[PDB]
Amino acid sequence: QNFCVVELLPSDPEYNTVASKFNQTCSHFRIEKIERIQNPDLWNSYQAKKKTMDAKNGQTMNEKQLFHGTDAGSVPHVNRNGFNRSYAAYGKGTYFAVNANYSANDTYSRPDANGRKHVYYVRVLTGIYTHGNHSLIVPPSKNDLYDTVTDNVHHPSLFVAFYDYQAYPEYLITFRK
Numbered sequence: 001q002n003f004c005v006v007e008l009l010p011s012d013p014e015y016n017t018v019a020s021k022f023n024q025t026c027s028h029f030r031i032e033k034i035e036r037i038q039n040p041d042l043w044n045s046y047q048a049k050k051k052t053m054d055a056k057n058g059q060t061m062n063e064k065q066l067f068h069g070t071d072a073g074s075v076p077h078v079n080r081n082g083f084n085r086s087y088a089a090y091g092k093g094t095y096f097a098v099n100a101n102y103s104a105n106d107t108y109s110r111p112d113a114n115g116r117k118h119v120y121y122v123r124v125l126t127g128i129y130t131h132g133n134h135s136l137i138v139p140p141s142k143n144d145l146y147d148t149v150t151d152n153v154h155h156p157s158l159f160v161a162f163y164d165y166q167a168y169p170e171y172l173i174t175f176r177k
C-alpha cells in the first residue's frame with residue numbers, strides 16, 4: 001500500500017489541465033497546490049478493472065474524470081487505499097461529481113483547522129450506468145448488474161461507485177475560500 005505524493009508547479013501543463021477543469025465552477029476559490037498521487041499497486045488494480053470493462057461494454061467510454069471532496073483526515077487514507085470499503089440518497093457507495101462545485105461544498109471538503117479544503121480529481125470507471133435509490137448497498141440488476149448509478153441518466157451531475165478499484169485518486173487539490 002505504498003505511494004508517493006508529487007507536487008505540481010503552476011508552470012506546469014498538467015497543473016493547468018487540472019486547474020482549468022476546477023476553475024469552470026470553482027474559479028472564486030484560491031488554489032494553494034495540486035498534487036499527483038502515485039500509488040502503484042492501486043493504479044495497477046484500477047487498470048486491471050479498466051482492461052476488463054473496455055473488453056465488455058463495446059463503444060462505451062468507460063472512464064470519466066470526476067471530483068471528490070473530503071476532510072483533511074481522510075487524505076492519508078485515500079492516498080493508500082483509494083475509495084475503499086472502510087471509507088464508503090442514490091446508494092451506499094462513494095459519490096463522484098461531474099463539476100467541482102458539488103465537491104467544493106464545506107460539508108464534503110470540510111475546511112480544516114487551518115481552513116484548507118480538499119478535493120480529489122479522480123479517474124472513475126463509470127461504464128454503463130442507470131438511476132439509483134436509497135436502499136442500494138450494491139448496484140441494481142439489469143434484467144449481471146451496471147457499473148455505477150447516477151442522479152440523471154441523460155444529464156448526469158454525479159456518479160456512485162460501489163467496488164474498489166473502480167476509482168483512482170489521481171490528483172489532490174488543496175485550496176481555500
Ligand SMILES: Cc1cccc2c(=O)[nH]c(CSc3nc(N)n[nH]3)nc12
Binds near residue numbers: 068096109
Ligand atoms: C455524497 C456526495 C455527493 C457529492 C459529492 C460528494 C463529495 O464530493 N464528497 C463526498 C464525501 S463525504 C465523506 N465520506 C467519508 N467517508 N468522508 N467524507 N460525498 C459527496
